[PDB]
Structures are given as structure tokens and as C-alpha cells.
Amino acid sequence: DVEFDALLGSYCNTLSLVRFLELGLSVACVCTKFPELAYMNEGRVQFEV
Amino acid sequence: CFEADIAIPSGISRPDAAALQRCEGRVVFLPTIRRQLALADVAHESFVSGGVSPDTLGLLLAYRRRFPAVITRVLPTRIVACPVDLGLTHAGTVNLRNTSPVDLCNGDPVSLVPPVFEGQATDVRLESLDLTLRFPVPLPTPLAREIVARLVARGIRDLNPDPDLNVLYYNGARLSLVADVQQLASVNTELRSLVLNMVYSITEGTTLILTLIPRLLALGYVNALLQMQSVTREAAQLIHPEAPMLMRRLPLYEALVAWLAHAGQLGDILALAPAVRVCTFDGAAVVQSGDMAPVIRYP
Amino acid sequence: CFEADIAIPSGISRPDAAALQRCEGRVVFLPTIRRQLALADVAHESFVSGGVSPDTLGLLLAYRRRFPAVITRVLPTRIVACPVDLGLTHAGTVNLRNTSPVDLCNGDPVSLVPPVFEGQATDVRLESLDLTLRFPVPLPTPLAREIVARLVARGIRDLNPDRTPGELPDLNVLYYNGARLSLVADVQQLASVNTELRSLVLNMVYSITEGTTLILTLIPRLLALSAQDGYVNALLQMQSVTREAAQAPMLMQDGERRLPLYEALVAWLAHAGQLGDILALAPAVRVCTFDGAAVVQSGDMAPVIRYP
Amino acid sequence: TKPLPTAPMAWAESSPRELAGHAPLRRVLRPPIARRDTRATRDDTEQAVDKILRGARRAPRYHLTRQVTLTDLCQPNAERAGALLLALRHPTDLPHLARHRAPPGRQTERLAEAWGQLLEASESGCARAGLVSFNFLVAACTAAYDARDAAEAVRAHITTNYAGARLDRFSECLRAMVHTHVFPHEVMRFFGGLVSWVTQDELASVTAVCSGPQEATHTGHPGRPCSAVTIPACAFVDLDAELCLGGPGAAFLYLVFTYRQCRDQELCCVYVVKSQLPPRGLEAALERLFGRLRITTCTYAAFAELGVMPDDSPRCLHRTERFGAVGVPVVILEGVVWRPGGWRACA
């Protein structure tokens, strides 16, 4: 008796990564990195029309 | 954590090795904290004392004398269990397995003997190496004490019999005590010896004070203060028990010694001091039955 | 480890300093939780209440109050003992030196006792500075609770005072394994025996409830088992009042849904179940040995871990 | 900038056995046995991965418990940096138990109506309501227990921040509970110190310390842009400070519920005691100082030990903090270590 047990392949997917800066939605916002909001309490915007 | 590595014996059947794999997260009592221990030392066949397998009382004795260690990783040819008693308090979170009621975000699980619930259910036998493992049930201290006292009372009624203690409402759904059938006959036969030590220690306690109070305060501040706050309580209970009962300072004092010891030996067995607490985080906060639960070393 | 330092005052004769060298592993009771402390707060001269040295039931009440601390190390000008009542949080297990005829086993909860045996060595007089040190005797709680019961009853029966002739039972002698253990019978003080009697009487009352009468019904049933089982035969001690108590429901059930049995157990278990603890100081430590040595010989160091 | 007495600072301004440990052991080979003869964002990502570096280069004075609850009872925002949160467990027994453990002459239906009524006043789904704050008890029993308006000042705090209904409904529950032998303890165990709430709408995720020292937590002036930190008793009404007579020792902190059993109609007293006595000595001093023993059963108080304040001195009493418009005698406790403890009342 010779009877083997084969593994006939191994597949895996690459999880891809989406940027968000290479999209449409990113026009809808002005994004900025304020690394210090964390130490901040309030923030505001003036708007005189 | 101080892991202690229990050594699986020689070749075991493939279905037995899968029985152990499912035992991760179960509480083991290890007789000594030696780093290298055998499996036979842990197995329930190592609880034999008087030539018999221990009853629920004989178990509760042993659970108070050896060290419970939760099983962390089960490996072929080794079981790694980290003793609950060793290290600093509030550290070494190791996962448990919930059995029965939920185990909410705290409450200090007690590991009480298995027979209190489905008896043989949890025996987990290993035929290849011819041994067996009975894992204690991890119940919260308020509920563990309520139950163990709840069953002793049922036992007393049963002792001589001619409101159901059994139905239990815990959390969301009514818990069930009775498995009906003859399980009760198996449950009641193992609590048989715990019931008696309870019945004895009561009947021996009252009659010993009911004889002592009237055989004391008749020989100062003792007298006045005693009868003062005992009005219609101790004295009333004295006339009523002496009514349906019988009545010696020398045997009194020597029996007051032997009772006082036996009593506190039951308070030690009983009260199921908590081994651990549950303190969760980034967790469900309620551990559903059969789900691993975080747990920490001191209440 | 919140260790409490204890300063050795001035100079205690080279023979006295050699006496403290061997006191490591012994137990001290400090009357506070401190960082700075004086050597004389620990001494037996501090146990002295107004004008009087407490007896051996008075010490138990003094060791009730204050905190047991096991000496870890002794330095030339300080004594380091970490207060088990608090600073027990060590990863591994502070060493307790077994001072007793007894032997610990493994897992035995250890409660302390004033020195109480017929042959004993707990003096440790230090002549340079007037002070002494009685070190408590560690002991398994089963044995330490048998002793306290002996001292309580001996202080009590004497107090009746037994009317009956002048030859009473022993109560001064024990057995642990083999080895007859003879307690010291010496003095009993009113106040020390009162409180011990007061709290004994007080708690045994609260353990009696309505449902208790349902249990007292079972005494004739017990003696039926006295005699047809070998256990239950053993349970009833030969000197059993219960045996003499048999030598009943009373209706009066208040609506039938209370469950007085269950409630009677809980009540008894609290007050009467916990009597070793209230009469004496409860265990805070239990022997544990990592090396797998399963006993501790008398005089050896017992590795000890937190509460049973 | 360097000292004169150098040896004391090399240790102050700042192992080799583990180095020597691997040295004989690990350096040794084949032993044993022997044979004879991208400005800011990029910076942030890199730092997070690195932080995983250092924290993964190594490895206990802190424990955090975290839980999600509603804002009906409790409420993290009203409260502050140092606060006692008590858990509340299993609303399911709307006096189901009231059936048992309730002595005759007791209309055990009181709880079910009192309590179910509480629910009407304030269903099960996304979350449950746990986490009673220390505050919310002080107000609920404020008129009940002994000092009024130092006590009611706390009640003004909760009505204006956390509803007088819920306080009144919850007070009716405390009365109904102390009535039927289901106590406020055997409910409401200690939960922690309230590190950070993170609430949304009616929801709150409350982090709080299981045990360990408080002051070493989020720290800062205050936790987040709130105010400082403290375990302020919140009552000059609570913070019963024992040790009227005392010597230096670590003060201790307990939690006591005092009750009235027809002397005042099921009184609820809740406060904290601070003195150096190890729980086996607190039962004695609780027997004294108390005349609340009115049988008028005998179970007057129930206590658990919260922890240590391993320094006697920080016991500041301040009727000076604002949790909104209201001002409360506030006693500040400087430094605390939490030992959860267990509930002991047998008598």
C-alpha cells in the first residue's frame, strides 16, 4: 500500500489598501493634520459675510 | 505567571487528545506548585482519600487544600496551568471558561465542586490512559454560597420528609437546580455527608448554648447584659427547644471545645472563598455561558 | 512591598545583636502602618495596657488589634518587616519561620498564637535597652482554633465557678498527630475572659432562628444514624451534648413562603460558622512550597502565600 | 547640572544580572552534559508603529475596567476626574426574590411597583443601565441621612447636571429595598475611579480603575481638558473621618451603608470612613458611634473596603467645586490605592 495525501495548492488574497486622497470624496473636504488637537478644548471659524 | 507544566502520559488516543484540547480554560487543582507535575496527580483519581472517591464534602475539603490553576495552553505532551494563588493580586489575567450563569463584569468566581449540577456531566474521561478530570464550576460568590446552602437545605428536608428551593431566578432566565430523574438521588447521596455535618453542628450548637446560658449567669455583668438583649430571643428559644427536647459543666466545657472546632472547620469548608475576580476591558462585560472570560487573581 | 523599617535603638550588646540576627522570619505586631517607627513600639512593653501585662487571652485581643508583620531582614540599624495585613503583595512568598512543635504541611492556613506550650522558648531579653520580644507561634488554623477554644473554656468554666468537686477535665492538653501538646495554664483575667465569653455567647445566639427549630426536630433522627452507620457514628463525639439532649414543627408557619431552612443556614453560617476568626485572629497566610517539599519541619522557614 | 555628592544622583537621576543570566546560560553552547577529554501624518504613523516597537521591547500598579452603560442613572460628564462609581446588578429581580427572604408582614410587592415604576419614570436592547455614581447616592439619601443642605447642596448638583424624578424614584427604590431585606448592598458593589467616559447620546463607555493608585492615571492638570484629579468625597456630609484620636498610619477607606428600620422608616445612610483600622477592627468601631440598631431583624450596616490612602495627610475638605452652577462641600483625598475588598455585614 502506497496512498498519499496531497495538498494541491495554497491561495491567499492581498488585502488592498485605499488611500482616501485618491478618491472623489476628498474634494468635498479640506483635510489637514493638526497633530495637536488632543491638547485642545474648543476650535472655531469666524465667517464674516 | 509562574506556569506549571503538567506532563501528559504516554501515547493517548486521538479522540482523547481532542478531549484535552477542549479543556483549555478549565480550573485544575494541583497538589503542589512544583514546576513539573504529572497528569495522574491532577486527575480525579488522585482525590481518593479513605479508599473511596470523595463526596461533595470530601471534595470541598480538597479544593481548600490544593492549588487551583487555570489551564492556559494545552499542548500535546504538556498541560500548562498557571496557579491562581501565586503572584501579585490583580495581575495575570488568564482566561476562564464560563459554565452555567453569566459571570458579569465582576463578582469573584468561586470554583465549587462539580456534583452540585449535572453530576457526571463534566467528568471528561480519558480512556487511553485510564484517568478522568472533574472540573469545578466557576460560579460567583453570592450565587455559589446561595446554591451550596440551598442544596443542603433541600437535603435536610429530604432527610426526614413526609416552597421550591430548586427554581432559581438568576439574571434573565429562571435557573434550574433539579435535573429531576435520579440525578437528585445522585446529588443527594453526595451531599449526604455534608448535610449531616451541617445538621450535627446546628443541633450540637443550640443544645450546647441552651444548656450553657441557664448553666451560666447563675454563677455579674454576664447575667444582666446577656438576658438584656436576649429578651424573647435566646430565652424564648430555650423554653421552646427544652419543650420538645431533653435538658453538667464538666462535659459541657469539654463538648464546647469539640464543637467550637468542628464548627469553624465547616465555616472554612463552606463560604467558598473566591479564587479570582472578573475584570474585563474591551470585552463584552458579561460572559455568556461557555465563553472564555477574563479573570484576575484577587477578589 | 511597603516594608516597615524598625530602628534598633542605641547599642544592644554584641550578644543582643546576635540574638536579633536569628529573629528573621519571625512575626512582629506593629501598632500602625508606618514607614518610620521605633523599636520600642514593637516590644512586649508596648503590649502592656494600663499598668498591666495582658494575660494569654489578653494578647490574642491585642494581636486582634495592630498588624502582624513577618521580619524579612535585619540590618545594623533597622529591622525590615512587611505588614502581611497590607503589604503581602509580593510575587513570590515571604519566609515564615516555623516556631512551634507543630508542622505545617502544604496549604495549611497559618494563624498566629501567643506562646502557649508547656515547654517554650519565647523570651529574647535584650539587656542593653530595656525591652523584650515575644514572638507569636505560627500554627495551622485547625490547631490554633482548637487552642483558643481551650483557653476560652478554661477561662470560662473556672469562672462559674465549678459547686461540683475540684477535679475538672483536662482542657489544657491537645494532640496534633501524635505528640501530646500541653498548654500553659497560668492566669485568666476578668476583662480578657469577659470579651471572649461576651462574643462567644453573643454570636451563638444570632445563629438561632425560626427555621432552626425545624432542625432541632432532627436530633432523634440523628441518633437513629448514630447507630446504623459507621460514619455519623464518628460524627457524634462521645461527649456529645446532642446525645444528652435527646435523653416539634409547632405549626406557626408565616404564610409558607420564606424558606426558613435556607435562611437558618445562612444565619448560622455567618455568626456561628465564623467563630475561630472572631475569637482569634484568622489566617492571613498559608504554607506553599515551590520546591515541592510538602511539609515544613519545626524550626524551618515556611514559604508562605497570601490568605487561604 | 551635576552635583558635589555624585553617588546619590546616579541612582536618583536614573538588569546586569539578567545580562549575566543569559551570559552563563545562553552564551554557553550545547550545554549541558559533558564529553570527557508626510510631514505630520507620516510622523504620526511612524511613531505609532515605533510605539509598538518599544512597548514590544519590554514586558502592576494600575487596572482599568471598562464598561458601556446609559446616562439615566450615574452620568460621567457631571462627575469628574476622581469619583466613586458603584455597580448595580440584575434589574431582573423586580422583587422576584421579594417573594423570599422577605419576612411576613411585608408587602413584597413594594419593590416591583417601586422599581418598575422607576423604569416607567426613566426595555432592553443595545445597552443596560449599570454604574451608579457615588454622587447619585448622596443626593438620593440626602434628605434621608443626617446633615441637610450640605447634603442638599449635592442634591442641587445632580438635579442641575445629571432629574429630581429619578432621584425620587431611586429614593423610593432604596426605601423599598431596605424595607424588604434586599439591601442596597448585595447590590451596588464598587466599580472604580472614573478615568474617561467617552459618551454618545444616551450611551456612555466608562473607563474606570479596577484597582491601583488613582493619581497616576491620565493625570495631567485634569484628565483631558476638564479639571485636575482627586477622589473628593463630595460631602462634608460624607467623609465621616474617624480617627478623631490618631497616630501616623496609612488611612483606610471603607464604604458603609447605614439603615433605619422603622426608627426612621428604612433610612439609607451612605458614606465613607477614613481611619487606620484593619477591617477586623472596623466592625467594633461601627458597633459604637451608632445607635441605628433599631429592631423597632438586626442588620444595621454593611461594609466593604475600598482601599488605602498610604499617607494620612491629604484629607482636604472643600465645599468648593463646581459641577455646573451648584457648589458642594467637597473633600479632597490626596493619593488613594484601590483594594476592591468584599462586602461584610453579618449583623
PDB file of C-alpha atoms in Angstrom, chain C residues 2 29 31-34 36 63-68 85-86 206 254-255 257-259 262 270-271 274 281, chain D residues 96-105 108 247-250 252 276-278 280-281 298 308 310 346-347:
ATOM      1  CA  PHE C   2       5.701  48.678  51.600  1.00  0.00           C
ATOM      2  CA  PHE C  29       2.820  43.186  65.693  1.00  0.00           C
ATOM      3  CA  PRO C  31       0.552  49.373  66.213  1.00  0.00           C
ATOM      4  CA  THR C  32       0.085  51.292  62.961  1.00  0.00           C
ATOM      5  CA  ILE C  33       1.027  51.088  59.316  1.00  0.00           C
ATOM      6  CA  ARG C  34       4.235  53.100  59.186  1.00  0.00           C
ATOM      7  CA  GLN C  36       9.281  55.296  60.401  1.00  0.00           C
ATOM      8  CA  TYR C  63      -2.938  40.711  68.342  1.00  0.00           C
ATOM      9  CA  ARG C  64      -6.528  41.211  67.191  1.00  0.00           C
ATOM     10  CA  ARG C  65      -5.759  44.913  67.158  1.00  0.00           C
ATOM     11  CA  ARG C  66      -2.464  46.046  65.406  1.00  0.00           C
ATOM     12  CA  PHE C  67      -0.762  44.380  62.392  1.00  0.00           C
ATOM     13  CA  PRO C  68       1.269  41.107  62.092  1.00  0.00           C
ATOM     14  CA  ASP C  85      -2.185  42.619  56.675  1.00  0.00           C
ATOM     15  CA  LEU C  86      -1.357  45.043  53.838  1.00  0.00           C
ATOM     16  CA  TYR C 206     -27.635  35.053  66.468  1.00  0.00           C
ATOM     17  CA  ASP C 254     -45.877  32.535  58.461  1.00  0.00           C
ATOM     18  CA  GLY C 255     -47.675  32.218  55.108  1.00  0.00           C
ATOM     19  CA  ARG C 257     -43.172  31.271  51.573  1.00  0.00           C
ATOM     20  CA  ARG C 258     -39.986  32.350  53.352  1.00  0.00           C
ATOM     21  CA  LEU C 259     -37.831  29.184  53.215  1.00  0.00           C
ATOM     22  CA  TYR C 262     -32.196  28.146  53.847  1.00  0.00           C
ATOM     23  CA  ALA C 270     -22.338  33.743  59.309  1.00  0.00           C
ATOM     24  CA  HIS C 271     -22.337  34.056  63.083  1.00  0.00           C
ATOM     25  CA  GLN C 274     -17.115  32.211  61.774  1.00  0.00           C
ATOM     26  CA  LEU C 281      -7.103  36.129  64.566  1.00  0.00           C
TER      27      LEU C 281
ATOM     28  CA  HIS D  96     -38.864  38.381  42.187  1.00  0.00           C
ATOM     29  CA  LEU D  97     -36.872  37.375  45.214  1.00  0.00           C
ATOM     30  CA  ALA D  98     -39.040  39.727  47.174  1.00  0.00           C
ATOM     31  CA  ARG D  99     -41.038  36.509  47.241  1.00  0.00           C
ATOM     32  CA  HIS D 100     -38.405  35.034  49.511  1.00  0.00           C
ATOM     33  CA  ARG D 101     -36.046  36.488  52.077  1.00  0.00           C
ATOM     34  CA  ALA D 102     -38.889  38.925  52.750  1.00  0.00           C
ATOM     35  CA  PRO D 103     -40.329  38.472  56.208  1.00  0.00           C
ATOM     36  CA  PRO D 104     -44.088  38.142  56.686  1.00  0.00           C
ATOM     37  CA  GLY D 105     -45.886  41.448  57.288  1.00  0.00           C
ATOM     38  CA  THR D 108     -43.042  42.325  48.923  1.00  0.00           C
ATOM     39  CA  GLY D 247      -1.199  58.341  65.159  1.00  0.00           C
ATOM     40  CA  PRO D 248       0.517  58.176  61.764  1.00  0.00           C
ATOM     41  CA  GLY D 249      -0.547  55.070  59.866  1.00  0.00           C
ATOM     42  CA  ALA D 250      -1.981  54.632  56.381  1.00  0.00           C
ATOM     43  CA  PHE D 252      -8.051  53.456  55.156  1.00  0.00           C
ATOM     44  CA  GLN D 276      -6.456  53.312  60.441  1.00  0.00           C
ATOM     45  CA  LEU D 277      -8.181  50.103  61.432  1.00  0.00           C
ATOM     46  CA  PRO D 278      -7.982  46.751  59.642  1.00  0.00           C
ATOM     47  CA  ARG D 280     -11.434  43.178  61.785  1.00  0.00           C
ATOM     48  CA  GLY D 281     -11.442  46.317  63.930  1.00  0.00           C
ATOM     49  CA  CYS D 298     -30.653  43.069  63.405  1.00  0.00           C
ATOM     50  CA  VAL D 308      -5.632  52.610  51.142  1.00  0.00           C
ATOM     51  CA  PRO D 310      -0.914  55.336  52.209  1.00  0.00           C
ATOM     52  CA  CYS D 346     -23.498  39.828  59.199  1.00  0.00           C
ATOM     53  CA  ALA D 347     -25.026  41.922  61.988  1.00  0.00           C
TER      54      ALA D 347
END
